[PDB]
Amino acid sequence: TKDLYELGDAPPLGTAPKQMYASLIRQERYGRPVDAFRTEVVDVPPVGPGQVLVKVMAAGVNYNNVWAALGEPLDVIAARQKQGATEDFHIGGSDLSGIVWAVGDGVRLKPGAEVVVLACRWDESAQDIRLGADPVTSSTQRVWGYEENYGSFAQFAVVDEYMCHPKPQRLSWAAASCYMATAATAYRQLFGWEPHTVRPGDPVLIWGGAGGLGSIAIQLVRHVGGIPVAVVSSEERGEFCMRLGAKGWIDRREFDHWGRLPDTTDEEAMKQWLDGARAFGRRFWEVLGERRAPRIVLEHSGADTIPTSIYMADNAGMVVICGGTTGYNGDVDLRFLWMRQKRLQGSHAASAREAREITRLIDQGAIDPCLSRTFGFEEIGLAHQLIHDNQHPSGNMAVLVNAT
Amino acid sequence: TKDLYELGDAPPLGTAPKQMYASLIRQERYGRPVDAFRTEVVDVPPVGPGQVLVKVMAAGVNYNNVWAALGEPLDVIAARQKQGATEDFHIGGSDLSGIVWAVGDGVRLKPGAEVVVLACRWDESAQDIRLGADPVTSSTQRVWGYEENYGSFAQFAVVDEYMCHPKPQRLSWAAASCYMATAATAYRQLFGWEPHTVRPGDPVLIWGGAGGLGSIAIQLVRHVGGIPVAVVSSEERGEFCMRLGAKGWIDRREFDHWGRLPDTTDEEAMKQWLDGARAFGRRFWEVLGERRAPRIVLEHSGADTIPTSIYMADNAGMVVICGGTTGYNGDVDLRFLWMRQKRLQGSHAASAREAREITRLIDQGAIDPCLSRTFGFEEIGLAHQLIHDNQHPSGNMAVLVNAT
Amino acid sequence: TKDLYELGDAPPLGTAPKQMYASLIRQERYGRPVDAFRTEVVDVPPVGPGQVLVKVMAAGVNYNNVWAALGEPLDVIAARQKQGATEDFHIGGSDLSGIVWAVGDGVRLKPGAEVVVLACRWDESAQDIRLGADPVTSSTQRVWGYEENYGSFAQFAVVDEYMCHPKPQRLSWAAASCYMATAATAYRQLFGWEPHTVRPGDPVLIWGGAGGLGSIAIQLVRHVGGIPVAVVSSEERGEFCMRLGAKGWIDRREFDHWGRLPDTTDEEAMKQWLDGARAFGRRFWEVLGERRAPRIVLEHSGADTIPTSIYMADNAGMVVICGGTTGYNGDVDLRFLWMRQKRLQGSHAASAREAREITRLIDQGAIDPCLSRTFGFEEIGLAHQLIHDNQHPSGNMAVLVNAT
Amino acid sequence: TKDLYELGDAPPLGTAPKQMYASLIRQERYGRPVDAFRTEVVDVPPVGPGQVLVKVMAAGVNYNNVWAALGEPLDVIAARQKQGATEDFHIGGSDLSGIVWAVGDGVRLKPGAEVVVLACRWDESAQDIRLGADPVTSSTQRVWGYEENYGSFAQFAVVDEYMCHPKPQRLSWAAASCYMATAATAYRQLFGWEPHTVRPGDPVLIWGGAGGLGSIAIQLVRHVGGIPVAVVSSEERGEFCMRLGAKGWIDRREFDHWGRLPDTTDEEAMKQWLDGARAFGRRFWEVLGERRAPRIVLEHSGADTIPTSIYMADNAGMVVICGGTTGYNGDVDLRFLWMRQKRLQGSHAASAREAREITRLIDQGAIDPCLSRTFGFEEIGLAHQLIHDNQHPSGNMAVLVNAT
Ligand SMILES: NC(=O)c1ccc[n+]([C@@H]2O[C@H](COP(=O)([O-])OP(=O)(O)OC[C@H]3O[C@@H](n4cnc5c(N)ncnc54)[C@H](OP(=O)(O)O)[C@@H]3O)[C@@H](O)[C@H]2O)c1
Ligand SMILES: NC(=O)c1ccc[n+]([C@@H]2O[C@H](COP(=O)([O-])OP(=O)(O)OC[C@H]3O[C@@H](n4cnc5c(N)ncnc54)[C@H](OP(=O)(O)O)[C@@H]3O)[C@@H](O)[C@H]2O)c1
Ligand SMILES: NC(=O)c1ccc[n+]([C@@H]2O[C@H](COP(=O)([O-])OP(=O)(O)OC[C@H]3O[C@@H](n4cnc5c(N)ncnc54)[C@H](OP(=O)(O)O)[C@@H]3O)[C@@H](O)[C@H]2O)c1
Ligand SMILES: NC(=O)c1ccc[n+]([C@@H]2O[C@H](COP(=O)([O-])OP(=O)(O)OC[C@H]3O[C@@H](n4cnc5c(N)ncnc54)[C@H](OP(=O)(O)O)[C@@H]3O)[C@@H](O)[C@H]2O)c1
């Protein structure tokens, strides 16, 4: 019976160790992700009622850990110490696959269970949830591993039972760890906002098709008989999108109207803007082989693309957005929005139901998680540096923890 | 049997006259609405299958006729002559009450029927409608009396049967003519976009509460047990909103952050903006008597207010907008939109179902059309000049045609 | 500091007493409700986390307590002792108004809060709820006060916080206690099953219009601009329905085709049945003043009426049922159901959201709880005997507990 | 230019012939389908506005033509002559693939277009449709080729443009003609009744899995990641269901509680019935590998199975039914229905949107039409005799018309 076990090792099934290895960010090393992370020994948090301790086999890589490593737009360690927190470190990571190792009171999962996690927490007793709100939209919702300490970049992780989903048996630990953040988010975007869900025959414009969200979105649209049109910044990435089932792709480099909308009273500026948007639209028609608009636009690029997305969406269509990679000003030409009765929908993460459904589709082989590269535990910094520099490969990445 | 009948007079019931009085805009008098309209004699258009000729008793006043009179943002007469049209005049008007006077083939309405109109046309055989689209959202939808010639500022008007709704018997001709454009639009905004419809207990932020849309919206929100908070620009208008059932009102003059959003990277500008939005939010809490956000925001003011509306809406809430009085740049802070999963919904006019439902509520006395002033046929110019100058009274206005 | 307080009295606010008065059913007095209940002193159950102790001011009367008193179709005390329960008595009651007197850990309500209860419990951690089920439909749902011991026929009652709703201030304790079981159930029936919810202009057939459910249903249908047609068994009861806003009423005594459906191959029997159903339908047309079918049928009478309800419902309409007063065989002629694409929907109780919404409408005066008679605590037996004998008055009844 | 062309031949593209070959039922040969049909020459009906004349390449086989051939439950020729019809024959057939040969006024399709038909007509100007009804549910809806004369058992057929859908290019004429009636109906059953549509992970009980509806249903359920459990009457048919993607199958011959429900007060009869239903339920659990209920039950067998279907459906689940092969008494135990809040939904045919969507899935290869046998034009009688005698093969059948 030991305080600390090496990675790959653990106390007897059913028992939590006092301490563990984890990858820590500290304020004194805020900056370039490559130098922000270091493996250290820390105390394992307590397992409360309704919680489990997971032996983490692999963990996913995420934009949010880049933010954490930089200390912007927020000093996570300081923001957390105000809440009354004692730790002067941050353990990130918001996707994982692993094995349930110990269980708290009231839990139905048993030690040995293979799980993947949806890295969202909420208060199941919240007033809004009680009166019918989807938990992920609760005032009490927060992102596990980013808005809270003790994420998945750790030998063991305490998770609430409701966060857990059955690991698809066909997947490696890395592949199972890499997908939930992007796949479940894309699934909620495309199928979570009635009555604007992808139907057979629907063209769907997918920004960043070769990226994490986009790679899952293309497969989902194809799977339901929709017509996925991907946007990319290289032929190589376009080819990846074709392999995933895209109808075709549009090279964003061939346009230069990207960015905020001019004042709608600036007639010359609007005419210039419209020229670019219409050129993009004609290219969309070309890829589609017909003069039709996308019924749904899968957004996340944000400021650069939102005006085009709004223009492109069909009458009674939806632009659904879960981020703003290029900036947070989403400039809408209200005329397109109201006259054609379009929906601009914000979306974030997924419900437990959605996490379970996308997991089912992945398990049955309808959808591939698109694992592109696997890192060792000592390479967490390198992995996030790649994302920081926009040099990460297409698809999703993973880090080995206890898995070999 | 005469070619032309004076206002108030008509051929025998069942028979269309060859000619009629109508209020005409001509290009040579484009400009100030007060001088744009003149009564002239014109040929009555043919009544085709599925159409009826209505003896117009009263007609509603509308922003769109101001646009028509100005010749901006479009020369309606020229835009229409390109389509191949022969007329060198425009007869506006997009709300009416009247009596069915003659019927085309296949029509179920009989002469004598008292009707009010939803001034929207669409092709009932349209591809999109056939595949399930709500007709008002069709690629084939257009506004009768504005996007088409021969509106309701005329002794008789040809309308398609599907545009017709039973006139509430309790209303004067003026009151029955004044309401459809605003009341049905507000009804679609508040009850037409599942799952974001007003429920008992929901706070609803209503811009322009004393205006046409707002006056109906406050009553509708109150009627279903929601909590209407009105925005106004005077105490007198606030008092009107209270009489309509508002919980309270906010004076927009007390804030100065109105307008487009700064670049989200401009930290000083954003902090200034947020200070104003939060001040507005605290005032909202005060009127409500509790720290809660509006679940639905009824928009139409547009550029000045949209950033505040987006900020204000509750998690999983909706900002629904049908115009842009102050401008067409709707600037969204994507962070508020996606992180709290908010919906920004464009809406326009109403479906026939919605027109019929709001008519039912008005008929049964649940909702008052808010007729504020009635004009004579020779005062159509004056009436629209008032709107042009923003000197029109609260509520909705009407013009007498054949009614005395 | 005393073990036991007389009705109307209590320990200091914030403190639970060791014992209390309650109205008990015991197996040795199973039978006629009038002799089944007796006031006794019992131990007050513990208040756990998330629970509160309510000082019960008044309690509602309910069919279910008749079942309990009879010992059919279930010996509640025996069924409960198998679960491992120790008590040899049953304290019924499934509606109450009262004052929060003591609170468990984690509760947001404070002592002094005036509440009414939705008498449904469920496990907020249930698997089905976690994956998106409405809690009232959970595998874990059960009726508080009937399927569990220690209901509201008691000086104090332990309730879970999620069961609580704010007592409308305008109502007496009796009126506030009498409504939730029927009003929230009717509200879920009529507004809870999208897309089949009552819209302005919809005719709605309401069985038992003068009864508990029906009295609320008529008001709700009228309130939203629907057209309520009530079924009754006397002119006096018809007149009550008119006062509540019914368009008119149908006397069920004038028909004799009630009951199970004949074999659909029995042509003479079907022709006889259809003759009665069509006669009922023509009477419906008469009350309505037009040849239209009800879009929604509010059911609960069950076996006698279901075949007629199914026949009557409009194309794409709904028959929604929450009980089977006359029997549990609901015989459907599948031809009417499939050819006209009708919905037969089972419904039970309400969600917390629905309980809160109907409470809001009652609070604002849109809906009256229809309190018909108030009893003293020693008359609980008499009150339920009335229901047993079908001699109870129209509307809803209540029993005073601590209220005077 | 000839009056009459042999099968396989036609006038020049764009031109309708005066006469055509067709397969006729006449009253004097009502009875066994094998002797009810005879090829004769008839006049081709006129092509009106919005209509097209299709050169029929192949036609589907259908239960409804058996009814027609028998003259029960209706003498179609007599029922139609009362409407004022002149013909003393009936040309059946309600599925077809073919080539548009001539077009009426206003039509967008061009001669040469390859189409399959949804054999439903409605009035696009109907009051109910105008106020929002799905056309297939209209008071004006009827089945083309059965409720109307001049179906697809004819060299040419007049169809309304809205009935037409693009023929999947990969399919033979026979395969394209065989699927719409069953595939679109099953698609509406499973995906047409929000919020009860098949989701990934949902078990679905499918009666008649090897049949027309069932064969499509199994594929659809599998495709969306649901778990299809088929009911069959032979091992051979079970094996077919496995090939289509079923999780497993249940042999209905192993149970004998099938049929109408006993009176719910008959305790011995109910206990016997429940024993059979529970045995069926345990077998369902076995096939599934877990103790779960089907969320959706795909019904059509009717009287024999409905009580079991209602018992089997999960809490808040749906039994959706489009026929009653075994009889029209659908006996519901209201206790299961209301206490567990289950939906019993009638469904018929499909909307145009649904026909187009299932066609898209078939075109893309997600779904196979399951063509089991193709007949010559002179074998229409034989084909329907097979169905009459329940000796037809699994899947769907077709008849060649102009195709070779
Ligand atoms: N729960 C959530 O809210 C949630 C979940 C997942 C992701 N997100 C957010 O969504 C965004 C995308 O995530 P991801 O995992 O898909 O990242 P990713 O793998 O980096 O993919 C994003 C892709 O967007 C494209 N892109 C970059 N700049 C662009 C521009 N100016 N215009 C158009 N496209 C551009 C790039 O592809 P090309 O260069 O080929 O165009 C890029 O690879 C991130 O901001 C992320 O934080 C949010
Ligand atoms: N089918 C459709 O799409 C449809 C239908 C109806 C209306 N609309 C559009 O909706 C808009 C409003 O229509 P309405 O009939 O209600 O007109 P209205 O009667 O003039 O009411 C609009 C009100 O908005 C308020 N307002 C004006 N400037 C504002 C600002 N800068 N910030 C905030 N509030 C301001 C004013 O009230 P206070 O000064 O008291 O704030 C004004 O009376 C118009 O642009 C109209 O064209 C569209
Ligand atoms: N959560 C739930 O599931 C829930 C909630 C509330 C009620 N329920 C159930 O719903 C049923 C009605 O409840 P309630 O509170 O409204 O009771 P109620 O006050 O007794 O009203 C029921 C009315 O139904 C009518 N009725 C009786 N026999 C009939 C017959 N053979 N045909 C047609 N109508 C008949 C009677 O009115 P006329 O004689 O005037 O026709 C009677 O007053 C009960 O079985 C109850 O248990 C269930
Ligand atoms: N638009 C519409 O409303 C529509 C559309 C299509 C079909 N339908 C109707 O739906 C029904 C089925 O159509 P289909 O095309 O699938 O016919 P089908 O190919 O004959 O399949 C029906 C299957 O049901 C099963 N069955 C027969 N008797 C049964 C019993 N007593 N209990 C349980 N299962 C039984 C049989 O399979 P096993 O012997 O292997 O169990 C049979 O092959 C027909 O009545 C048809 O008229 C309606």
Side-chain angles (χ1 to χ4, degrees), chain A residues 187 194 199-201 222-227 353 357 360-361 364, chain D residues 187 194 199-201 222-227 353 357 360-361 364:
Chain A
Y187 186 83
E194 295 292 346
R199 296 165 316 175
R222 180 57 80 194
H223 184 71
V224 303
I227 311 163
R353 181 184 55 79
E357 292 176 12
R360 171 63 179 183
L361 293 171
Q364 289 305 288
Chain D
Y187 186 83
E194 295 292 346
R199 296 165 316 175
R222 180 57 80 194
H223 184 71
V224 303
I227 311 163
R353 181 184 55 79
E357 292 176 12
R360 171 63 179 183
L361 293 171
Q364 289 305 288

Side-chain angles (χ1 to χ4, degrees), chain C residues 20-136:
Chain C
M20 66 175 178
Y21 291 99
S23 188
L24 276 61
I25 292 168
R26 293 185 178 272
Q27 286 163 306
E28 75 200 271
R29 53 182 181 260
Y30 280 168
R32 298 175 55 70
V34 59
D35 298 320
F37 298 87
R38 288 184 184 166
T39 303
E40 306 189 27
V41 177
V42 301
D43 290 339
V44 179
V47 179
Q51 299 189 306
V52 297
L53 188 75
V54 179
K55 181 184 178 189
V56 177
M57 295 297 276
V61 182
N62 198 284
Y63 269 55
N64 289 287
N65 304 305
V66 172
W67 293 128
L70 291 170
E72 296 169 347
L74 182 55
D75 186 335
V76 173
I77 293 162
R80 182 166 302 137
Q81 278 172 342
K82 297 186 164 74
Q83 289 179 277
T86 290
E87 296 85 351
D88 60 349
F89 58 84
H90 171 70
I91 298 167
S94 294
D95 269 334
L96 75 87
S97 64
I99 301 166
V100 176
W101 217 255
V103 300
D105 293 321
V107 170
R108 293 182 281 267
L109 288 172
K110 297 184 309 166
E114 304 181 330
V115 301
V116 300
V117 164
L118 173 68
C120 288
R121 299 181 82 200
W122 43 75
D123 177 1
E124 295 188 304
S125 70
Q127 184 65 84
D128 55 15
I129 291 174
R130 284 178 165 170
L131 295 174
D134 205 353
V136 65

